[PDB]
Design a protein around this ligand. Structure first.
Ligand SMILES: [Cl-]
Length: 30
């Protein structure tokens, strides 16, 4: 599943701004 905290942290680790869980997907904000 997608979990909010982990998704945000994954996204930031890759150089994105943040991210959110949408429909089971961790979608990063650029
Ligand atoms: Cl979700």
């Amino acid at each position: 599943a997608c979990y909010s905290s982990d998704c945000r942290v994954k996204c930031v680790a890759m150089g994105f701004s943040s991210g959110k869980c949408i429909n089971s997907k961790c979608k990063c904000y650029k």
